[PDB]
Write an enzyme that holds these catalytic residues in place. Structure first.
Site, short mmCIF file in Angstrom:
data_model
loop_
_atom_site.label_atom_id
_atom_site.label_comp_id
_atom_site.label_asym_id
_atom_site.label_seq_id
_atom_site.Cartn_x
_atom_site.Cartn_y
_atom_site.Cartn_z
N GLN A 100 11.52 -9.64 -4.71
CA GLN A 100 11.04 -10.24 -3.47
C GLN A 100 10.70 -11.71 -3.71
O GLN A 100 9.70 -12.02 -4.37
CB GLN A 100 9.79 -9.52 -2.93
CG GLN A 100 9.44 -10.09 -1.55
CD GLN A 100 8.13 -9.60 -0.98
OE1 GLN A 100 7.07 -9.78 -1.57
NE2 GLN A 100 8.19 -8.99 0.20
N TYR A 186 3.24 -15.45 5.46
CA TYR A 186 3.57 -16.44 4.46
C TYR A 186 4.42 -17.59 5.01
O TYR A 186 4.58 -17.71 6.23
CB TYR A 186 4.14 -15.74 3.23
CG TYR A 186 3.06 -14.88 2.61
CD1 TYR A 186 3.17 -13.49 2.58
CD2 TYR A 186 1.88 -15.45 2.12
CE1 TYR A 186 2.14 -12.69 2.08
CE2 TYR A 186 0.84 -14.66 1.62
CZ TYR A 186 0.99 -13.27 1.60
OH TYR A 186 -0.03 -12.48 1.11
N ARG A 233 12.36 -9.35 4.82
CA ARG A 233 11.19 -8.64 5.32
C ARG A 233 10.52 -9.44 6.43
O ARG A 233 10.31 -10.65 6.29
CB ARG A 233 10.17 -8.37 4.20
CG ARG A 233 9.17 -7.29 4.59
CD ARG A 233 8.27 -6.85 3.44
NE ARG A 233 7.92 -5.44 3.60
CZ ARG A 233 6.80 -4.87 3.18
NH1 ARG A 233 5.86 -5.59 2.57
NH2 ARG A 233 6.63 -3.56 3.33
N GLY A 322 3.77 2.40 0.12
CA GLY A 322 3.13 1.46 -0.79
C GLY A 322 1.99 2.03 -1.58
O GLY A 322 2.15 2.39 -2.74
N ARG A 323 0.82 2.10 -0.96
CA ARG A 323 -0.34 2.61 -1.66
C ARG A 323 -0.09 3.97 -2.33
O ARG A 323 -0.55 4.20 -3.45
CB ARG A 323 -1.53 2.59 -0.70
CG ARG A 323 -2.06 1.16 -0.58
CD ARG A 323 -2.92 0.91 0.64
NE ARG A 323 -2.13 0.82 1.86
CZ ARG A 323 -2.61 0.39 3.03
NH1 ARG A 323 -3.88 0.02 3.12
NH2 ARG A 323 -1.84 0.34 4.10
C1 LIG Z 1 -1.68 -3.89 -3.98
C2 LIG Z 1 -0.88 -4.33 -2.76
C3 LIG Z 1 -0.12 -5.55 -2.90
C4 LIG Z 1 0.87 -5.96 -1.88
N1 LIG Z 1 1.66 -7.04 -2.13
C5 LIG Z 1 2.67 -7.31 -1.25
C6 LIG Z 1 3.79 -8.21 -1.67
O1 LIG Z 1 3.78 -8.85 -2.88
N2 LIG Z 1 4.77 -8.41 -0.75
C7 LIG Z 1 4.89 -7.74 0.51
O2 LIG Z 1 5.76 -8.03 1.25
N3 LIG Z 1 3.89 -6.80 0.85
C8 LIG Z 1 2.90 -6.55 0.00
N4 LIG Z 1 2.07 -5.49 0.20
C9 LIG Z 1 2.27 -4.66 1.44
C10 LIG Z 1 3.11 -3.41 1.12
O3 LIG Z 1 4.44 -3.71 0.72
C11 LIG Z 1 3.18 -2.42 2.28
O4 LIG Z 1 3.91 -3.00 3.37
C12 LIG Z 1 1.81 -2.02 2.80
O5 LIG Z 1 0.92 -1.60 1.71
C13 LIG Z 1 1.87 -0.94 3.86
O6 LIG Z 1 2.42 0.31 3.32
P1 LIG Z 1 1.48 1.50 2.86
O7 LIG Z 1 0.58 1.81 4.04
O8 LIG Z 1 2.47 2.64 2.58
O9 LIG Z 1 0.75 1.10 1.62
C14 LIG Z 1 1.00 -5.12 -0.69
C15 LIG Z 1 0.14 -3.88 -0.54
C16 LIG Z 1 -0.64 -3.45 -1.65
C17 LIG Z 1 -1.36 -2.12 -1.32
#
Ligand SMILES: Cc1cc2nc3c(=O)[nH]c(=O)nc-3n(C[C@H](O)[C@H](O)[C@H](O)COP(=O)(O)O)c2cc1C
Ligand SMILES: CCCCCCCCO[C@@H]1O[C@H](CO)[C@@H](O)[C@H](O)[C@H]1O
Length: 365
Positions: A100, A186, A233, A322-323
């Site tokens: 990314q 961003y 994205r 994600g999480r």
């Molecule tokens: C620890 C953490 C760091 C994240 N860093 C980024 C990232 O570097 N780039 C991005 O596009 N989204 C980032 N996200 C967002 C996730 O890609 C994802 O869209 C978001 O957590 C929602 O999905 P979830 O509810 O399944 O966790 C981050 C989320 C977490 C939890």
């Protein structure tokens, strides 16, 4: 029950094992000095290689593209080599991985970009937003973002050049493709969303103008490595990091159609950002499905049932978790069997070492 979720899918010249995506997640574990991807990160990603596709955490395209302490870069020879350790580990497990490419724009602090003032579409500070910096200790130091300076024509040319080179660097590092982070408030998102863009030149002022930077960056990425290796994205409705658009349905359906014209291999919608989970109308999702006809990925508070439903309803081709992937390296197996999911520990999401990164175990009854 996840039957469709466990169907393979073609992504350009690749054939993925299932419809599950490990979305990009910043963990701020890069080696210092140099912000270099490393061994523990390679183990971390390899542990999660049962995903159909892994998208790396955001990786900055230049020194001034960084927004958080200890995130890995993708612009120096050592950084490329560090990422190579990661892609080699992931590929040994049989999985595709995209880098990314990141430029945070105004969502940063001078401490993270060599004392420089952040850049953006305009001089608008992101309201109620914080990032974290390194403060002579191993614990993220949260700070308010700084007021950015508006990008000049030259700055725009520079950033496009940095993105283009970063894509080539990603290929040199062994990635299967790149994902352009044009979401979560961003840099590119700072141009797309109307309330974050007060420019009076051709990069602001109209919908076409607001999408111009995205258009030009994507054109360069495609020119560099091929449309089949470029994903993008977007975050149409979340506003957590400070970007709000006045007519997101129009703006983002237009953006989806524009990206479709570029034939990018996938469009990834960040549907939820942390606790920012805005209602995302199915009618809107269906419009995006017609505007963009490649692989459509959604991430944000999905569970097995919702993921399967989104795919069967024809709204998405792949779903990112994600999480749950942070705490369950074998998330796919757990989703398929209905095994209980471990929960992640917020305190170890950023910074530190292997604890809270590579020590979440696989499921054991
Ligand atoms: C620890 C953490 C760091 C994240 N860093 C980024 C990232 O570097 N780039 C991005 O596009 N989204 C980032 N996200 C967002 C996730 O890609 C994802 O869209 C978001 O957590 C929602 O999905 P979830 O509810 O399944 O966790 C981050 C989320 C977490 C939890
Ligand atoms: C065929 C199996 C190859 C296994 C290679 C394992 C390489 C581990 O490498 C080690 O990883 C540690 C973090 O986990 C780092 O702290 C060490 O410096 C690094 O050498």
């Amino acid at each position: 029950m996840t039957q469709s979720l466990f169907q393979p899918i073609t992504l350009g010249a690749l054939t993925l094992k299932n419809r599950i995506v490990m979305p990009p997640m910043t963990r701020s574990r890069a080696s210092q000095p140099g912000d270099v991807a490393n061994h523990m990160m390679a183990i971390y990603y390899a542990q999660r290689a049962s995903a159909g596709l892994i998208v790396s955490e955001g990786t900055q395209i230049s020194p001034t593209a960084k927004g958080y302490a200890w995130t890995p870069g993708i612009y120096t020879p050592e950084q490329i080599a560090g990422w190579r350790i990661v892609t080699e580990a992931v590929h040994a497990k049989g999985c595709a991985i995209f880098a990314q490419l990141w430029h945070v724009g105004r969502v940063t602090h001078p401490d993270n970009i060599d004392g420089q003032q952040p850049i953006s579409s305009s001089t608008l500070k992101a309201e109620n937003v914080k990032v974290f910096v390194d403060n002579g200790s191993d614990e993220p130091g949260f700070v308010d973002v700084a007021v950015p300076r508006a990008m000049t024509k030259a700055d725009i040319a520079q950033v496009i050049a940095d993105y283009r080179q970063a894509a080539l660097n990603a290929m040199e590092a062994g990635f299967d493709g790149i994902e352009l982070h044009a979401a979560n408030g961003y840099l590119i998102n700072q141009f797309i969303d109307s309330e974050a863009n007060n420019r009076s030149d051709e990069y602001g002022g109209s919908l076409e103008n607001r999408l111009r930077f995205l258009d030009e960056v994507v054109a360069a990425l495609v020119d560099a490595i091929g449309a089949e290796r470029v994903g993008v994205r977007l975050a149409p409705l979340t506003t957590l990091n400070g970007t709000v658009d006045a007519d997101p349905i129009l703006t983002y359906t237009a953006a989806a159609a524009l990206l479709n014209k570029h034939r990018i291999v996938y469009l990834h919608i960040a549907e939820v950002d942390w606790d920012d989970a805005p209602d995302t109308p199915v009618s809107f999702k269906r419009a995006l499905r017609e505007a963009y006809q490649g692989v459509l990925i959604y991430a944000g508070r999905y569970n097995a049932e919702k993921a399967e439903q989104a795919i069967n309803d024809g709204l998405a081709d792949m779903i990112g978790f994600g999480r749950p992937f942070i705490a369950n390296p074998d998330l796919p197996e757990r989703l398929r069997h209905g095994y209980p999911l471990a929960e992640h520990v917020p305190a170890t999401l950023f910074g530190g070492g292997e604890k809270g990164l590579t020590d979440y175990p696989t499921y054991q009854a």
